[model samples]
Target: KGEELFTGVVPILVELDGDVNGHKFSVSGEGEGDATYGKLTLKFICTTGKLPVPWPTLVTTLVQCFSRYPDHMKRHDFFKSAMPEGYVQERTIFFKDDGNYKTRAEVKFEGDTLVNRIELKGIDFKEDGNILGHKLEYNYNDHQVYIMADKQKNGIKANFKIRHNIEDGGVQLADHYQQNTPIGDGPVLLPDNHYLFTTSTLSKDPNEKRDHMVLLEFVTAD
Candidate 1:
């Protein structure tokens, strides 16, 4: 009468359509506690516990990892002032971590006529927990989608979305992050059973990209 091989966490129901400054601003929220242990999983719509302040899960916090197509981040200058020309990317992310919940993403609704539909009830791993990016929990929709866990090669990965400083595109995304830790921050995951043991800061050092500090701290136990 028990389970822990990556059971769904819970409380993740969200719905949001676009056009924030246009007229239609839709968001029905709920998120916090949709994590998987074994094969690595995440379904967060944070501000966890509702903005008590503890997000940006360290790990060198540098949101905007992948899913590309941000029009080359608006043609450089490190995300070009975070979307200058009539900005309107009200949360539209979509990342799939190579396989088996490595870091699935399809969290839609960002500017330029966005379209995303997700409906998953009871969190299904094999059947259907809505599917796209599979549920975790992190509401406020995407005020600044930020997060990242640590370690790799032994299990332990996070990486949500949004919040890209670019520090003027840190060494041009650190040569496009060829040796790890840059551009967004991860791809690491390989230690489960509830952390087992963790310290953090596996890698990241292009001069802190000027600000967001390339220092990730994840401390865990048991």
Candidate 2:
């Protein structure tokens, strides 16, 4: 409602559905969130607080992300999600980390499969360098997940499902990994599946939101 944009611990931004050309956003699916963030991608154009219009490059910077992937996601991994159909303003996406691990994500379509692709950049991996080149994909066909790193090109496959933690309703999955391949140590317990990140939905009440963070564990489960 102020600064024409609002953000938080989450990279998501929010505004009422009536601003900065709301018609450019899908009215459902991503368009549905609580009373803050606009629940759609177009509104995120304002996340930089740079005002993506008047120049329109911000729009192209957004869509160009689609051009970076390979052609097939396969039938066994169908990922199509509801989205808007049309054009957006043009802008270049700038990647800077400020020594803090920041991430951005986009959706990719390979025929019917909707690949929720996450790109990591500027994360200063003290233990492992060159990690930003990895591809961490999710919201998969089986609802299980995978992450791509220098070690695993197509993807390092795993059998972890994001389970909603009972008491707090936060998302969790086991730190599922192969034998003896050590992951980094931190309060975060970094996954061997290096391309790590999280996405979220809004709760109706502010109190219901969990900062529980995206630790899509390649961790504990049977």
Candidate 3:
């Protein structure tokens, strides 16, 4: 082999195997395209614990295993994929629109069922308006999945459907988050709440990988 082998997109395969309190976990995958991005499969066999571990914690710990690696992974892209079925998927809603209006919506999901949902109403969008009282704050609310106006929670409901596949009579289901809701007209309107937001889907199947962008704002609506 010559040095030229290193010039192009380098091929990389990584695997990590370990145990936590007798619970065995494995993370293995290969780099795609430029090697900067890749697909990873995380598996944890809970053999000891009487009650299963929380998905948020399990996903966090599994991702930390890749800290020493050189390649960077899409954070939000993977965590949602690691969440299992029959458990609750909870996330907080906090997004700022172009009108400077702070919108909030909280949601909880159990597999394909939307267990709980709360859309905030009558939130001020002005600098002099009271925001602290109306703001929705919660722990670990980092995923900004939507960026529409205050009353557009319906958009989220419509796009948040999780699909389950059937393979040989086996139901394959996981936290599959894929939403693209674009709202607001062009600059023709004198005043409008124009915002666009999208989310990517990196499925449980390691062979699938799609690169995408997040929320974008044009200007504060009048």
Candidate 4:
């Protein structure tokens, strides 16, 4: 017999099979609950497929990237939000910086409305900074949007950039600036292995305040 389950949150596991390289490989993980706000299931899947690289290596790289900044672990919430179908993630860090901070967040969607918007505040490490701001906006037809910073203007601007991975759609990778760029913004990873880059405007005042923008990214065995 089949039964329907409902609750404030739920956990589930799924199995997926795909090819990575010419050889055969298998990849699997426990997709517990809603990627944004829910409990995670400790489930995993295994199958036959090909991978460009070893699964463990890929996982190690991703784990290292997330572990770079423990504070930014919340960014994973945003990544979970941008998933194709939708997903539920536990405590994970989607994007982090060497400065030991999280610049982005991921979340899960319930129906049409977004479940929760996790804010990774305190990204600005400047001295005596008072203003904090963060935003993540995307449109299916808009191509890509970027945020910039100008100390003199005291405001941010939205710029468009050429994008790759248009086949899969969503944002592209070229959109994001390289890591450690001056005044760089969080990296929004699209579903197709691309990224939406961003930066920010100088705060109105440089007091002891903070602001942040959370972005998303998707990864697999390379």
How far out, in Å, is residue 175 in model 1?
Answer: 22
The TM-score that candidate 4 achieves is: 0.24
List model 4 lDDT by residue over 1-222, tens digit each.
000122223333223332222223343433333222222323222344233221221221111111111223333222332332332221221222211122222233345333322222222222221111111122122232232322343222232333222223333222222121111132332222222322211111234132211112222211
1-222 per-residue lDDT for model 3 (tens digits)? 111122234333323343323334343333311212222222223333221122222221111111111222222222122222111222222223301111222222233322212121222233322222222211111122222222342122211212222223322122323222212221111112222222223223344342211111111111
C-alpha TM-scores of all predictions: 0.17, 0.20, 0.21, 0.24
Candidates' C-alpha lDDT = 0.22, 0.22, 0.23, 0.25
Considering lDDT, which of the candidate structures 1 and 4 is the better prediction for this target?
Answer: 4
Error of 3 at 203 (Å): 1.0
Identify the superior model by TM-score, candidate 1 or candidate 2.
Answer: 2
Model 2 over residues 111-163: C-alpha lDDT tens digits? 33222333222223322211122222222211233432223322122323333
Tell how far residue 37 is off in model 4, in angstroms: 8.4
Residue runs of model 4 more than 4 Å from their true location after superposition: 1-7, 34-39, 49-54, 58-222
**Most lDDT-accurate candidate:** 4
After aligning candidate 3 to the native by TM-score, how far in Å is the CA of 127 from where it should be? 45
